[PDB]
Design a protein around this ligand. Structure first.
Ligand SMILES: *[C@@H]1O[C@H](CO)[C@@H](O[C@@H]2O[C@H](CO)[C@@H](O)[C@H](O)[C@H]2NC(C)=O)[C@H](O)[C@H]1NC(C)=O
Ligand SMILES: *[C@@H]1O[C@H](CO)[C@@H](O)[C@H](O)[C@H]1NC(C)=O
Ligand SMILES: *[C@@H]1O[C@H](CO)[C@@H](O)[C@H](O)[C@H]1NC(C)=O
Ligand SMILES: *[C@@H]1O[C@H](CO)[C@@H](O)[C@H](O)[C@H]1NC(C)=O
Ligand SMILES: *[C@@H]1O[C@H](CO)[C@@H](O)[C@H](O)[C@H]1NC(C)=O
Ligand SMILES: *[C@@H]1O[C@H](CO)[C@@H](O)[C@H](O)[C@H]1NC(C)=O
Ligand SMILES: *[C@@H]1O[C@H](CO)[C@@H](O)[C@H](O)[C@H]1NC(C)=O
Ligand SMILES: *[C@@H]1O[C@H](CO)[C@@H](O)[C@H](O)[C@H]1NC(C)=O
Ligand SMILES: *[C@@H]1O[C@H](CO)[C@@H](O)[C@H](O)[C@H]1NC(C)=O
Ligand SMILES: *[C@@H]1O[C@H](CO)[C@@H](O)[C@H](O)[C@H]1NC(C)=O
Ligand SMILES: *[C@@H]1O[C@H](CO)[C@@H](O)[C@H](O)[C@H]1NC(C)=O
Lengths: 48, 533, 49, 49, 49, 48, 49
């Protein structure tokens, strides 16, 4: 029971490294590199 | 002509609290019977506001008549409290000189007047009004208004002089915002009976104007009356005004059935305010609740770029005497320099400036681990083909961009250079090949081409020279005219910055929540020393 | 409606009312098939009733 | 199975075996405020959380 | 084969919908129709969905 | 219990016939027809 | 410029922050004419927007 709940949180943080089809897994990297006109398309892919 | 002043004290800058004062409708969307939580420039609750005054002393021996130039932030909360209608209007602008346009808003004696001009403002812009019964006399506001590009005048009204002494009876509140060229004015009115300061209380300000002024508003100052019984020895009396600055904050707003705001929570104000905003509700049952951070938001920004000052050689790279033929395009490293593109604006205008994986106006504040520039000339008709996934004689046999390209394609017409007839250098493209190039592959071979997989020993049937000249005569139409192209290919690796945008750089701020930008890597957080290696 | 309001929406952003621009009359908009409908059947292959 | 007054723990003897026999993934809640700003090796899934 | 044309004519526009121009070289089509006309160079923008 | 588990798998395979807003339900048909520059936008809709 | 802002100022511009009185080194007229001669190529021709 401890291991299952520990593991679930560990997979949940690791899921933040997924791109979900954005140009980057990193939010600051999109916002650094793209303008709102087209950053928001990429940010919405990470949010969803 | 203008009035003049003397024996004038400096402003004292006494400060007061905007106690729940100065809420306004954040946008034009009609909402009814809903709670809306929103981020916008609002005046925070219990924010400081700076007071400015108009008071004679016992005699003209010393006077306050405060018309300093007041900075305009992302917006201003302004409240006038008065009895004798002293505060007539404002000048909004940049320099507040005839060297740049300013907006004048006047609650003039019978009309609201809005004018945008290059104004020669008076040194102390004011009305003069004959005290006992004179609704007007003269307006020492400006000498000249040279280039008036906007005017508005409201319908006729009357003002009482209300010259009686004592407590201030009127509180007039305003919010000014300047967004997308519009000056937004919100206002509200409250009956008051107070001797000093702002009274505490909730206020919502309704939209009064959207003004399509288009001015660069960074400063303002108030226009006030001075009074005389004899049209001489004008004096200042009976008013104060308070200025507060809007700051980007989250508010939760409650909209009536009629869609009026009737309560608001400044989510940053208290833990109870953060709770109310977290549970999206103005009433909260007994309990313990997890609360989302509205406590702290970054205000300072730290921008830190390598201290390389040398500008990139784009003038040299772009204004070469001749470029490569597209079949023999040349690649060059660009390094240890500041990629200021604005140096070109005086010299070359680009018909194409299309960037991939980078937005062309974030480009001014990135830094790159490496940059390569590929240079060649093509038809204006062919510049289409310089993009990922294109096809055609250039993309197939001369110059292929990769599908994963990141970089910018830059092109400009050079008929005044590359299509001169004066002994001119010829430009060629490969027209025939046995296969398509790979991305950033080159083929400078000039062996005769046969459609059959055979040697030629030309001249022969089914043998052709692979390279065609471009017809860059000066007579040809713009599709056939030469365009120079450079393709900048970037990479943004975890490696030392080699080219940077022109951003100025600022001191470190540590142990505070800040915005930061290191070599274009930008975010928000707390910076500290570290044990990391 | 408020004097300048042109349409109204519920909490679902369902446009439930609109001001006729010619009459200035306020119209309600209902969904085209309000409420539940359900069909009782014995099996097909025993009756089509 | 009763507590022992000769021990600092107010658990029984059996209960002290049970509490030793299960190992917590974080060894306890107190990953305190200062503790994640550590060395490069001190990166930790609990700090990532 | 469009490469037959690269020595005769360069196209100011070659814009494809639902098919990419590169993959175009290795598809087959159940049918093709060609619609032919002349327009201003200024009007060519208008021949798109 | 048998019927429910049969029907759960049958609906799962049939859900591969959905487009999910891509130009086609058939993955080979996108990859056949579009460049990687723009197939990936379609593939991501199928993947998600 | 910010969006939909205008700047009709015509003071002499220095690349240095310090002002000038022209004619002088390191300052320039900020405004340049378009060369809308009837001879110029189509990129240089005037378009109304
Ligand atoms: C790279 O070089 C090779 C060798 O010259 C090229 O291979 C030729 O390709 C065409 C079409 O595929 C054939 O008709 C030739 O017979 C090939 N040559 C040989 C020696 O086999 C190749 O096309 C070039 N380009 C790329 C991208 O590989
Ligand atoms: C004006 O300034 C002095 C400090 O120089 C301050 O002590 C005083 O209270 C102020 N009075 C008013 C009326 O602002
Ligand atoms: C200005 O604001 C800060 C915090 O909001 C407060 O500590 C300070 O007292 C205010 N100014 C004056 C004059 O009180
Ligand atoms: C602005 O006003 C001053 C004051 O007289 C004057 O010297 C200056 O010439 C005016 N601006 C211009 C562009 O002339
Ligand atoms: C300002 O008020 C005066 C006095 O009533 C009026 O005559 C004048 O028309 C107003 N301003 C303008 C621009 O009309
Ligand atoms: C502003 O007005 C003056 C006339 O006083 C004129 O010479 C100048 O060209 C005008 N400027 C603009 C931008 O219209
Ligand atoms: C809405 O406005 C009308 C007219 O002002 C008023 O009669 C009505 O009571 C108002 N309703 C609320 C909830 O304020
Ligand atoms: C290119 O540079 C030379 C020397 O620096 C200069 O004479 C020439 O005018 C430049 N050409 C352009 C188009 O800027
Ligand atoms: C800008 O170009 C003009 C010619 O159009 C030239 O006189 C001036 O010196 C140039 N200035 C800079 C900074 O390039
Ligand atoms: C036109 O609009 C007005 C006001 O919206 C309305 O009174 C009138 O009935 C409409 N139709 C005609 C034919 O006037
Ligand atoms: C290609 O075009 C040139 C004229 O530009 C012509 O001389 C040559 O014969 C043509 N060859 C083929 C294979 O079309």
């Amino acid at each position: 029971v401890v291991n299952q709940n520990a593991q679930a949180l560990n997979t949940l943080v690791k899921q933040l490294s997924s791109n979900f089809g954005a140009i980057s897994s990193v939010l600051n990297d999109i916002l650094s590199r793209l303008d709102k006109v087209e950053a928001e398309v990429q940010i919405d892919r990470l949010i969803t | 002509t203008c009035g003049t002043l003397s024996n004038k004290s400096p402003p004292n800058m006494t400060q007061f609290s905007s106690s729940r004062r100065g809420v306004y409708y954040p946008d034009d969307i009609f909402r009814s019977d809903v709670l809306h939580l929103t981020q916008d420039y609002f005046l925070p609750f219990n924010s400081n506001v700076t007071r400015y005054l108009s008071l004679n002393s016992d005699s003209d021996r010393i006077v306050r008549f405060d018309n300093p130039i007041i900075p305009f932030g992302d917006g201003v909360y302004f409240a006038a409290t008065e009895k004798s209608n002293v505060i007539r209007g404002w000048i909004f602008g940049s320099t507040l000189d005839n060297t740049s346009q300013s907006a004048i808003i006047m609650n003039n004696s019978t009309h609201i007047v809005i004018r945008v001009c290059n104004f020669q403002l008076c040194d102390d812009p004011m009305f003069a009004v004959s005290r006992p019964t004179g609704q007007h006399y003269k307006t020492w506001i400006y000498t000249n208004a040279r280039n008036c590009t906007y005017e508005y005048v409201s319908k006729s009204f009357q003002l009482d002089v209300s010259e009686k002494p004592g407590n201030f009876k009127h509180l007039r509140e305003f919010v000014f915002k300047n967004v997308d060229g519009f000056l937004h004015v919100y206002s509200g009115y409250e009956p008051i009976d107070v001797a000093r300061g702002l009274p505490s209380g909730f206020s919502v300000l309704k939209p009064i104007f959207k003004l399509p002024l288009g001015i660069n508003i960074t400063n303002f100052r108030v226009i006030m009356t001075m009074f005389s019984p004899t049209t001489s020895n004008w004096g200042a009396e009976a008013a104060a005004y308070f200025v507060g600055y809007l700051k980007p904050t989250t508010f939760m707003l409650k909209f009536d059935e009629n869609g009026t705001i009737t309560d608001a929570v400044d989510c940053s104000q208290d833990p109870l305010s953060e709770l109310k905003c977290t549970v999206k509700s103005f009433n909260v049952e007994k309990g313990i609740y997890q609360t989302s951070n509205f406590r702290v938001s970054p205000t300072k920004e730290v921008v830190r770029f390598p201290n390389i000052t040398n500008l990139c050689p784009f003038g040299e790279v772009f204004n070469a005497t001749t470029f490569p033929s597209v079949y023999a395009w040349e690649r060059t490293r660009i390094s240890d320099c500041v990629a200021d593109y604005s140096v070109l604006y005086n010299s070359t205008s680009f018909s194409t400036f299309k960037c991939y994986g980078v937005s062309p106006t974030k480009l001014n504040d990135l830094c790159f681990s490496s940059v390569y520039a590929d240079s060649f000339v093509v038809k204006g008709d062919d510049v289409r083909q310089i993009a990922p996934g294109q096809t055609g004689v250039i993309a197939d046999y001369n110059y292929k961009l990769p599908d994963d390209f990141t970089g910018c394609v830059i092109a400009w017409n050079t008929a005044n250079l590359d299509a001169t007839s004066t002994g001119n250098y010829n430009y060629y493209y490969r027209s025939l090949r046995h296969g398509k190039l790979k991305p950033f592959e080159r083929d400078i071979s000039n062996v005769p081409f046969s459609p059959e997989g055979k040697p030629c020993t030309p001249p022969a049937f089914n043998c052709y020279r692979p390279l065609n000249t471009y017809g860059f005569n000066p007579t040809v139409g713009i599709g056939y005219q030469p365009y120079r192209v450079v393709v900048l290919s970037f990479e943004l690796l975890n490696a030392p910055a080699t080219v940077c945008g022109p951003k100025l750089s600022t001191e470190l701020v540590k142990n505070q929540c800040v915005n930061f930008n290191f070599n274009g890597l930008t975010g928000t957080g707390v910076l500290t020393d570290s044990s990391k290696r | 409606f408020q004097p300048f309001q042109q349409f109204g929406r519920d909490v679902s952003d369902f446009t439930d009312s609109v001001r006729d621009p010619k009459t200035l009359e306020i119209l309600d908009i209902s969904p085209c098939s309000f409420g539940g409908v359900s069909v009782i059947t014995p099996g097909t292959n025993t009756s089509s009733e | 199975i009763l507590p022992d007054p000769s021990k600092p723990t107010k658990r029984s003897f059996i209960e002290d075996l049970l509490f030793n026999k299960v190992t917590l993934a974080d060894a306890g809640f107190m990953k305190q405020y200062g503790e994640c700003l550590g060395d490069i090796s001190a990166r930790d899934l609990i700090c990532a959380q």
